[PDB]
Amino acid sequence: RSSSYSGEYGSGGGKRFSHSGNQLDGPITALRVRVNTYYIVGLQVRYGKVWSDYVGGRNGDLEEIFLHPGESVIQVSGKYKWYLKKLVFVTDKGRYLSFGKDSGTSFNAVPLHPNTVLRFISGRSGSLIDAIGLHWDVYPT
Ligand SMILES: [Cl-]
């Protein structure tokens, strides 16, 4: 009734990953994004207290952000072409958490149903992030 999906943004390269089985650990509380001049290289997401497996490669610099207590992502925009290139996570505390350089084809993802937040991500990866998708749902009870 409340879940929705935005995606997939990127190419068909790489291999699928999904954090759907990480939801049970809790809401998103932190993000790691490995970045270079051209690409989103890797991703890791913290669900409650539990970091997901890392996906992607190592040819970039690791950027990390903890969300403030009770803060959630409510919109994600970005850029891609043959791989993912840029991500901006917009939060319900007004923060715009940006990773990567402005180049490529844009996407702009918002949740379909009322009062939902980013609950987990999925996508495709190898040595880079080939594609990403955003999964929205209610903030967990
Ligand atoms: Cl590209």
Numbering used by the authors: 22 to 162
The authors write:
ZG16 binds microbial pathogens, and lower ZG16 expression levels correlate with colorectal cancer, but the physiological function of the protein is poorly understood. One prominent attribute of ZG16 is its ability to bind glycans, but other aspects of the protein may also contribute to activity. An intriguing feature of ZG16 is a CXXC motif at the carboxy terminus.
ZG16 crystal structures also draw attention to a nonproline cis peptide bond that can isomerize within the protein and to the mobility of glycine‐rich loops in the glycan‐binding site. An understanding of the properties of the ZG16 CXXC motif and the discovery of internal conformational switches extend existing knowledge relating to the glycan‐binding activity of the protein.
